[PDB]
Short mmCIF file of C-alpha atoms and ligand atoms in Angstrom, two decimals:
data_model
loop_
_atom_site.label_atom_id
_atom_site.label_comp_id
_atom_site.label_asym_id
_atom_site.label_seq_id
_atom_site.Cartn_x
_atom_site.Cartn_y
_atom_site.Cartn_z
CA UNK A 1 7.66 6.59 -20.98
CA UNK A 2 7.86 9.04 -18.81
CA UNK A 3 5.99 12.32 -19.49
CA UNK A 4 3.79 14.78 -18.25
CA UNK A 5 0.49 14.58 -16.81
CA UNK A 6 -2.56 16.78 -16.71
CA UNK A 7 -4.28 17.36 -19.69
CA UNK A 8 -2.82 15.26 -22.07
CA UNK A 9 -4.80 12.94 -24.47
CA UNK A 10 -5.46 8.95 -23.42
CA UNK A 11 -5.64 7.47 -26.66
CA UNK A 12 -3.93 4.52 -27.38
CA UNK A 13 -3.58 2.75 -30.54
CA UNK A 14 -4.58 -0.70 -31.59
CA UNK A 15 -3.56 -3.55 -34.74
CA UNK A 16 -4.69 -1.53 -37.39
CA UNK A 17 -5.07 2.33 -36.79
CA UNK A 18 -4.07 5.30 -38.00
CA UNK A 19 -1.87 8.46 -36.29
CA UNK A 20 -0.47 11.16 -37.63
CA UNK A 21 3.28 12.21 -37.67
CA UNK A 22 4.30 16.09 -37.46
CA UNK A 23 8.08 16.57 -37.94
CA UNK A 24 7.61 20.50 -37.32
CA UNK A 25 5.56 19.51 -33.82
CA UNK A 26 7.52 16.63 -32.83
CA UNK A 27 10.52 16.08 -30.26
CA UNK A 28 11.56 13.11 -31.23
CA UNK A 29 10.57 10.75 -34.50
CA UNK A 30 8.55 8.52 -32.62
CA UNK A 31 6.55 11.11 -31.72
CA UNK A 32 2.56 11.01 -32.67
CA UNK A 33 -0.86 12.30 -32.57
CA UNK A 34 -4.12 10.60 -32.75
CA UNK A 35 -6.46 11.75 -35.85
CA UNK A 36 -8.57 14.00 -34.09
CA UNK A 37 -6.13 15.80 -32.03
CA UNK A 38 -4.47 16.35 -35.51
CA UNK A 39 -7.92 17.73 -37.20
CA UNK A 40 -8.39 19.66 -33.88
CA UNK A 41 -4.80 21.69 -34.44
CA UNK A 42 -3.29 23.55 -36.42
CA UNK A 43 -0.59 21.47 -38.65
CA UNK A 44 -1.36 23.22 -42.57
CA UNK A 45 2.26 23.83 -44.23
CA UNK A 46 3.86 21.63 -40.95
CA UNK A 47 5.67 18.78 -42.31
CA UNK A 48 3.36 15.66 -41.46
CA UNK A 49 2.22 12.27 -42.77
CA UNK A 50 -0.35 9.67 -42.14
CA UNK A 51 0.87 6.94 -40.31
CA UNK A 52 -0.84 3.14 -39.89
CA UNK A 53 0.39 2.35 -36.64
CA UNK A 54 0.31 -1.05 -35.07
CA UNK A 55 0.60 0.36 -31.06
CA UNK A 56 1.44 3.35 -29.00
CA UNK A 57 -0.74 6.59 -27.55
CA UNK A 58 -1.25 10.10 -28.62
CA UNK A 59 1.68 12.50 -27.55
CA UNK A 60 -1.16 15.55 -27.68
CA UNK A 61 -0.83 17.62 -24.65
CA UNK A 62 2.33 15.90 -23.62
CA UNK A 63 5.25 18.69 -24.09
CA UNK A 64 7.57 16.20 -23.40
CA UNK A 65 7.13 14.28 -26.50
CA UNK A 66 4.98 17.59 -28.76
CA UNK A 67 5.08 21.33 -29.14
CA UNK A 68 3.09 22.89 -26.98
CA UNK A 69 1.76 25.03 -30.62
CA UNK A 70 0.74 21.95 -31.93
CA UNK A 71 -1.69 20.87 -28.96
CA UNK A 72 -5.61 20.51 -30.41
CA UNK A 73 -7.86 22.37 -28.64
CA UNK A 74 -9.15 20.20 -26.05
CA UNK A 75 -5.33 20.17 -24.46
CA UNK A 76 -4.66 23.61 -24.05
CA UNK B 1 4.36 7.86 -28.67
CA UNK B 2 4.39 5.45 -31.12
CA UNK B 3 5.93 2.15 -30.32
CA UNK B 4 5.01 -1.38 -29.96
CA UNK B 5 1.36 -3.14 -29.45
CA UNK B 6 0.71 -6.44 -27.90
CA UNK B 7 1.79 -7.95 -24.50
CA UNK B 8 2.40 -4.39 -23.41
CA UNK B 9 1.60 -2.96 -19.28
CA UNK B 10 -1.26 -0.27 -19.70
CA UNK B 11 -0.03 1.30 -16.33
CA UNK B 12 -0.32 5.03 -16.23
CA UNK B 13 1.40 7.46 -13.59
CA UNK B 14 -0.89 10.02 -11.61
CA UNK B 15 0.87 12.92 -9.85
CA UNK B 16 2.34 11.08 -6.96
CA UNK B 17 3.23 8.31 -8.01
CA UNK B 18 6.43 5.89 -8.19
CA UNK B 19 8.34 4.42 -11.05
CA UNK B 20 11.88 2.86 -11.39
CA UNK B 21 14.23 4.20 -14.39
CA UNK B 22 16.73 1.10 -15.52
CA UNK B 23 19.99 3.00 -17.32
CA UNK B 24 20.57 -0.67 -18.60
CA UNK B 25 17.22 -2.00 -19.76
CA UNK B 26 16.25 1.44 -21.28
CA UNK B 27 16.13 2.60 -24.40
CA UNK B 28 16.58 6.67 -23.77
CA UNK B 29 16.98 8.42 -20.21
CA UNK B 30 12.99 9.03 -20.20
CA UNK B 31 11.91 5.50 -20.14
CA UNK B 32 10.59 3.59 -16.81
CA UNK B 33 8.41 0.74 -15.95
CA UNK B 34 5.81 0.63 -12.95
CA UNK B 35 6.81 -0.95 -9.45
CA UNK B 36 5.05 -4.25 -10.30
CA UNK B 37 6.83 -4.83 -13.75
CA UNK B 38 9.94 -3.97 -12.07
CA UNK B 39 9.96 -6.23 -8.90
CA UNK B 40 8.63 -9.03 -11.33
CA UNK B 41 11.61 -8.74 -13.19
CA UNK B 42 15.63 -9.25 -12.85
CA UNK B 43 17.16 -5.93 -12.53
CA UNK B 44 19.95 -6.56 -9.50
CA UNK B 45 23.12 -5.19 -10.36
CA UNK B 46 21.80 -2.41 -13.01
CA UNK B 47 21.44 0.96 -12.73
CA UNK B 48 18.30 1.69 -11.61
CA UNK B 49 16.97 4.08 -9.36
CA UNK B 50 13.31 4.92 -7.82
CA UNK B 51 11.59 8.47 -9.31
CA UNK B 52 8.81 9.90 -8.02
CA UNK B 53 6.33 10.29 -11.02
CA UNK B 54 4.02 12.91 -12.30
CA UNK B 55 2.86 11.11 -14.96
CA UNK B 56 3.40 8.71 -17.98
CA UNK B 57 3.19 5.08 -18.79
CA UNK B 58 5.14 2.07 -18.03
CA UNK B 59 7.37 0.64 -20.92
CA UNK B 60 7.01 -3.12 -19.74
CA UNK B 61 6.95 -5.02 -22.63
CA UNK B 62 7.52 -2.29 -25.68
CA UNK B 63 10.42 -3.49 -26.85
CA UNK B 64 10.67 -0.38 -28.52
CA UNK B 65 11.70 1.56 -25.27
CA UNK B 66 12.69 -1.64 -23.31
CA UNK B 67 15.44 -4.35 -23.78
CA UNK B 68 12.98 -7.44 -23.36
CA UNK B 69 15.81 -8.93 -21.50
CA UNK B 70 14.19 -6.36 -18.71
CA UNK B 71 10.77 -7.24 -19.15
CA UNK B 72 8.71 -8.86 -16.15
CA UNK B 73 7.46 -12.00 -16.30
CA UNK B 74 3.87 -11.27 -17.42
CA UNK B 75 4.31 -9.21 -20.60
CA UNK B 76 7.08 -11.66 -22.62
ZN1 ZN C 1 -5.05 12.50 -29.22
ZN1 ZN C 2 -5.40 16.69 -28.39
ZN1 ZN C 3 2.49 20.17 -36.61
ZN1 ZN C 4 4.24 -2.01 -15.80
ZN1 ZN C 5 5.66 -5.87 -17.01
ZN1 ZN C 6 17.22 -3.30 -15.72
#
């Protein structure tokens, strides 16, 4: 999709991996980070869940697809 | 985001870069596929249009942000 660039987060998920949802963070449902950028933030009464996803890439650092509040650390 | 694994184009968009949007093969108004996935593929009388990127990724083959009818030849 579309998006921004700079300093947003590469990862991309394979067959068998896990992301993490954040309905307070997220703009849209599809919306995702990687487990890291999750432990890296702050999420603690947010409204997420653990998610075994089959494909995509982490929307961390993206504030197209996540709340600029919800970025880790290591994407401003 | 999340979306679909397998036969998917990696492409990424740098900060001058150039995608095409397809109103009819997309899913919402942010998704786009890279030059290559486009001219491989049959898009003649929808509505696309160039767009000068900053960044994202190409949606060539995720049939959750692309009608597969408007995939390229090389990813389904
Ligand atoms: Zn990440
Ligand atoms: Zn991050
Ligand atoms: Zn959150
Ligand atoms: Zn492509
Ligand atoms: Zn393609
Ligand atoms: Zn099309």
């Amino acid at each position: 999709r579309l998006g921004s660039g700079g300093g947003v987060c590469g990862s991309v998920w394979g067959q068998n991996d896990i992301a993490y949802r954040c309905r307070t963070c997220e703009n849209d449902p599809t919306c995702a980070i990687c487990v890291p950028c999750f432990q890296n933030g702050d999420h603690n009464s947010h409204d997420y869940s653990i998610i075994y996803t089959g494909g995509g890439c982490c929307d961390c650092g993206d504030e197209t697809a996540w709340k600029p509040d919800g970025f880790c650390s290591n994407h401003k």
